[PDB]
């Protein structure tokens, strides 16, 4: 007699992980970037760059 | 006034005096 074409089956599980990193900003160099108080010459200065 | 190395070569208050 002939043979029937078998086929398989499997169930795989997702194994979960996570990686994380971080940095930090100084309080001194904080107000130099965001704050819109710097009017005329402190927007294009060397310290802000 | 913050400059780079670029170069060229009232009111009436009450007080005692």
TrEMBL record, chain A:
Top-level taxon of the source organism: Viruses
The protein's name: Major capsid protein
Organism from which the protein derives: Suid herpesvirus 1 (SuHV-1)
Residues of the whole record sequence present: 100 to 148 of 1330
UniProtKB/TrEMBL annotation, chain B:
Source organism superkingdom: Viruses
Name of the protein this chain belongs to: Major capsid protein
Organism whose genome encodes this protein: Suid herpesvirus 1
């Amino acid at each position: 007699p002939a043979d029937q074409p078998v086929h398989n089956y499997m169930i795989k599980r997702l194994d979960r992980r996570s990686l994380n990193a971080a940095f930090s900003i100084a309080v001194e160099a904080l107000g130099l970037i965001s704050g819109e108080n710097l009017d005329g010459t402190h927007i294009s200065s060397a310290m802000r760059l | 006034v913050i400059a780079n190395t670029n170069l060229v070569t009232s009111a009436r208050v009450r007080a005692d005096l």
